[PDB]
Symmetry: C3
């Protein structure tokens, strides 16, 4: 029996793809990592293909559900997961076929830029977006899609292009988070949306990963500044975790994967640069354990 695939589900391959790329950067330090990087990679791409097929199905037979998602001042943001993961799969495929990889990366970059130009600017005409629309998911089209373009174009050798996209993501981040934290302080989020709190972890770590990708792994003052703020939000989120899962654990916690994987990626670069190697090992293992718990609970839900 057919069914419209919920767009949020792209968060699953996203996380897994990100984790692949983290292990991929351990290769020259520990060659066995390459094996791990391949397995995650293949799995992430399999799911991605399947999900793309399902979403194409949803575009033909449930198109009005997609349109309603697209016009919502909140739900549209999850549409951005599609180009994002498309770019990440591109990065994975680069290790085997740089030509398919570049095609995918350009599809994802052009698509996310076009999505945000169409929709996020249109938010500025007012009267649709409301105060209660201020959701962490807004980071996906505004910030994460940009950081992913930046690292992917860097992967292809377009470093200055990557810098333009990186600046767009970083300043969009700093421009949106103030009002998001203020809204969280005043109204916060209903249990149905609380799992979305995990995206709050993402901006600093995704930022630093894209920055280190474009600047050839140079762990400078900026990268440490970013890492400090990221660990601050990590601690806040750890303290908040009981409240976030107050109504029970659920697949929505895949929202943390993006931050967790990015932490692991950044950890790798901090480890090559010989900066805070102990914190790096801790971060790398902790994000891997957390994404492993997520995969275990997702298999338990699927097989039951």
């Amino acid at each position: 029996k057919p069914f419209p695939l919920p767009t949020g589900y792209f968060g699953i391959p996203l996380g897994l793809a990100a984790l692949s790329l983290a292990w991929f950067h351990l290769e020259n330090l520990f060659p066995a990592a390459r094996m791990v990087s391949d397995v995650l990679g293949i799995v992430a791409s399999a799911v991605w293909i399947l999900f793309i097929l399902m979403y194409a199905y949803k575009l033909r037979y449930y198109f009005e559900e997609v349109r309603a998602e697209y016009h919502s001042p909140v739900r549209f943001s999850f549409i951005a997961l599609i180009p994002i993961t498309t770019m990440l799969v591109g990065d994975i495929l680069y290790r085997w076929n740089p030509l398919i990889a570049e095609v995918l990366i350009w599809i994802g970059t052009i698509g996310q830029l076009l999505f945000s130009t169409l929709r996020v600017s249109e938010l500025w005409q007012g009267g649709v977006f409301e105060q209660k629309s201020t959701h962490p998911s807004f980071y996906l089209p505004a910030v994460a899609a940009n950081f992913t373009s930046a690292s992917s174009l860097a992967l292809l050798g377009y470093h200055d292009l990557g810098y333009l996209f990186f600046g767009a993501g970083m300043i969009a981040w700093i421009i949106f988070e103030p009002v998001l934290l203020q809204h969280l302080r005043i109204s916060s989020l209903e249990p149905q949306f609380r799992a979305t709190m995990g995206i709050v972890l993402a901006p600093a770590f995704v930022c630093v990963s894209a920055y280190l990708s474009i600047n050839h792994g140079e762990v400078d003052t900026l990268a440490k500044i970013l890492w400090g703020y990221g660990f601050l939000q990590l601690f806040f989120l750890l303290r908040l975790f009981p409240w976030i899962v107050e109504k029970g654990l659920n697949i929505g916690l895949w929202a943390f994967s993006f931050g967790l994987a990015s932490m692991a990626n950044s950890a790798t670069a901090f480890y090559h640069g010989n900066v805070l190697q102990g914190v790096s090992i801790f971060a790398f293992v902790f994000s891997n354990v957390m994404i492993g718990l997520l995969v275990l609970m997702t298999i338990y839900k699927l097989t039951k």
Copy 2:
């Protein structure tokens, strides 16, 4: 028959002065640019003189209109156009008389600092500024006046002073834009004010132009970050343009000139630094075509 000159009209020489200075930086790459730079320069200064005279007239015979502008939590910002363009005319005059140029630049810097100290701080006593007061024009006294002081003082050799003013402008920018974008998302702007959306283009490009002026044209990571965010807002604004001019074209679109000219200026520096030369040429030509359309429509309105 006398008439009080609307303060917004200083936007016209402002734009033209900025465009002059952009072409001025092409001189060592294409000497013919110097000719263009002179013509724009002279025209910008002519208008400036005329406008200053009119505004002096308005200060003597319509003073209460100026006072009402000054006390408004929205309209006061356009007063800042006067020192800003005063500084820009100073920069133009530097090519011929550095002494008049320095006098003008100090007048403009002291005047804008004194204006903002008097008025913007007073906003913090509450009860006059309202949520509906959150207008893009607030960037003029808070951000642009500062960036203009920074580049002008740099022009005079006061680089560290210029850096103080640059930091004031950049952090004021980052501190105000979050709530401005949130307000645009929720309420946006009535057609009477929509042309003011063009000032949203300005901060990143004016920032980067002032930064490159103070740092001797060094196109570094910061300048590329700024350029990326500026092009993001440019694209948003292009998408929004039909809505902005929904009630018809009008002289208010001169609000875009400041961003457009600044883009052209930054383009010049990016071209000397051999960074994204294709994007630079595109930006330079596009801003020149847009300001040319503005001059053509302003002549059509004046001669009809």
Copy 3:
């Protein structure tokens, strides 16, 4: 007759400790400064000890007042003064006993991190913090505690750790000030709270002092950017001062000490780096005169 010590009173040794450390950095330029640095230092530590004892008393016999402070979405922030000054006293003691100094600095760092993880994140569950809770004092646990950890750990040789804490403070600063200034524009502050406006001066100068502490006194572009924004807020505050003390002078003005002392500290580094030496001397003297007026009025209040 016993009495619960008001937590805000830690602002007094804080300021004095900060001023000590400012003079301490003049030593190699003017050895007499070391004498001044010692006197302030000893006084700051005496008060600190006394205040700690009183607060321990308040914890045993007035515990419910402390708990009510802790649960308030506004008043909790002053609790952060305790670790902050604890760290500052640690820094002073370093000149004589590095072992006690390190113990104090770790107590203060662990304590402030734990305080903010417990309480500031909990703000994000909503419904307690209100729009009217947006107070400048929020900078203490969010921003200043972090900058103080950063400089203290640097003092101990943990420069990369210090950078993590510095980034947390700087991005927390930039993330909170937008909504604070917007709230000040719209509602501002009742006379009972107006003295708290002095904390608005603090972020940029405390930031730059921590940054120069961690980066070995290198006065670079960032430090000048910060100094420019700090002087902008200084001027705004000077203009606002009559309104701030509209209902009369009071001990609450010690809220300015933290910014003033930090200005003096930054001035020292700017003077060693040979950057804006005239502005540096002015800043150093002006903050010293202002904290001296504060000490004089506090003695007049105590002896009367």
